Amino acid sequence: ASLTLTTLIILTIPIMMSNSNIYKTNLYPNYVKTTVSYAFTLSLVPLLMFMHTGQEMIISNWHWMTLQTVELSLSFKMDYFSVMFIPVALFVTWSIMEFSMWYMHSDPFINRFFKYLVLFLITMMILVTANNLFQLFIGWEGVGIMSFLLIGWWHGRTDANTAALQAILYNRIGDIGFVLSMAWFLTHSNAWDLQQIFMLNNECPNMPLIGLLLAAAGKSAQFGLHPWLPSAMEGPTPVSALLHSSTMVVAGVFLLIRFYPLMETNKLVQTMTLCLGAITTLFTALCAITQNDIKKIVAFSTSSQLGLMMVTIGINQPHLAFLHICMHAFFKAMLFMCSGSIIHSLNDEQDIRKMGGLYKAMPFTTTALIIGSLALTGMPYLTGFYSKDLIIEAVNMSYTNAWALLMTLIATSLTAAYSTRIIFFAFLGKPRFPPLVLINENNPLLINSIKRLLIGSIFAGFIISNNIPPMTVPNTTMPLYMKMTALIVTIMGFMLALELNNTTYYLKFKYPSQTYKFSNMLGYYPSIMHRLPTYHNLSMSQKSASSLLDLIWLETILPKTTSFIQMKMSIMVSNQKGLIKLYFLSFLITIMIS
């Protein structure tokens, strides 16, 4: 009990130290990396007490505001999920610390940058741990705004700002659904607590689950909400590595994971979740096939992974769905950091088409990127396997809609596809980056970082798949091609993508087909869903609302009316003249009437 709360609270202290003069020193950040280090060291312990005996805990140390009936209070449930997840975040983020010390080493305000890092992570901890739903909302929204502060880090260029605003916007659109659900549980279940809600809702909830689903779509970048995530790469790399790889965006489905039994109450929820998660895997992966940024490709990848695990929830297997995240973080952090090594090495040139062929120029980064790509690919005993195979297999043997399963298949093909694209252009070719070569892999902390993530990247799949209690109950029978399919689809991926890529190498200019222009225009989706509705609204908010509705009628209807009528009346009564015969005769007739 004391343990977990300590593995949270100590993280708070450096921010407190932020006003202390040490913050102004160059010396500060290493206290932070060390801080997360101790935090991790401490963080392992609850997991082990969780291991052999398996106990789980909730604490709610202090009620915050006792309403009638409802009395919300902060409450740190520490179940399987919340205990297992913390060491992961501490681990990868610690590696990001060590990375960032080098990636930014030139940069002024770097100390502030780390402050924002810890400030982000702590909110993430607020989200993963919280029992009481409202506390989940503070973790939610706070993570959102940290995303805003970090995306806009290079605040000078406008594009960073638009990206930030874009991200907050789609998150907010999800937040509408989150609030709808959040109200509905209170109106009905009278709760805001997972105990209450799990207890009282044996009955089917026809609607809250869908709005909550929309909220889950928020962070997770489903198909209707994907674009901000690709645009979020515009912030400096260690940031995008930090959370758009893993620590942020996975939380959006993590929410949905937390509420499995209610999902289980419905059929339509598992349904639609699958219905959409599949198609976002596909539609994202297609754009992922054909890009030129390192980071955009890796971004589309991460979202596609998210769609996959989203059907993993929608296939009614939450446990594996959570299992996939814990593997996923290592992979993606690996990719973005090695990519950061490339990019920093070359004076920052994201575009692959003038990215060199540097297989030998940076051999260690090469190794790293290779194990990474193989891990994401889903190689048979490497870490990505223990998720991906179990997943898609379970999807196979499950009763379900099939067309979505098909989509899972094309998607898992395309994984191999773009994953080979980046390898090919990054390394194999005779180099074509502009001459001079400032390249310098060397700087030991970076090395140590990538080392540790490789270590996890290879052992963790086996170790964790072994240690966890068998909540899965395995399906292992008919047929044989069942298990083969995951491999053969990959192999088709490498064969087609690679022979195609080599065919690109044979002169003969061609001009693009329509499919190329489509999938490489990110599905056209941003360029239509952004240049259109925003125009109709910003026009409408002036063509109408700002203007005629409220500056010109709403003022005409009662100030300008009376103000005019008094003009007429006042010039009429006070008619300036004053000839006697006039009004005097008026006295006459007014007497005759009176």
Partner: protein, 131 residues
């Protein structure tokens, strides 16, 4: 006004409409009277032109108001609620809108004359004392 008051309800629309026409004519003669009194027309024929104008206009307004009101009473057969006059109220402005040949003044007259009439009926229903 006591004559006009015994509607009853809205039966025999003509009997009522004649009375409203009478009231409109009366007010028209008064307004014409002060107008002539305070705006010396010059050349008396123009003065009777003026009074013919106002008298006919107000008489028209009263007529159309009365009969649309009673017809609405004899058609909707609600027939007692205030809205029953309001159409006529709204109608009345349009009459006024026609003689002035202006959409604006006709439009405003529709709304305010309507609300005034509605308040009148509401008042008959509630015994509001005014004086």
């Amino acid at each position: 006004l006591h004559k006009y008051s015994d509607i009853p309800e809205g039966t025999e629309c003509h009997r009522k409409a004649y009375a409203s026409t009478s009231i409109g004519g009366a007010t028209g003669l008064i307004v014409s009277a002060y107008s002539i009194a305070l705006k010396p027309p010059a050349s008396f024929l123009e003065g009777v032109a003026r009074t013919g104008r106002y008298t006919f206009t107000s008489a028209a307004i009263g007529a159309i108001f009365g009969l649309t009101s009673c017809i609405s009473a004899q058609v909707r057969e609600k027939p007692d609620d205030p809205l029953n006059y309001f159409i006529g109220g709204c109608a009345g402005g349009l009459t006024l809108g026609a003689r002035t040949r202006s959409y604006g003044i006709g439009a405003a007259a529709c709304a305010y004359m309507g609300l005034t009439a509605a308040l009148v009926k509401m008042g008959q229903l509630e015994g509001w004392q005014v004086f």
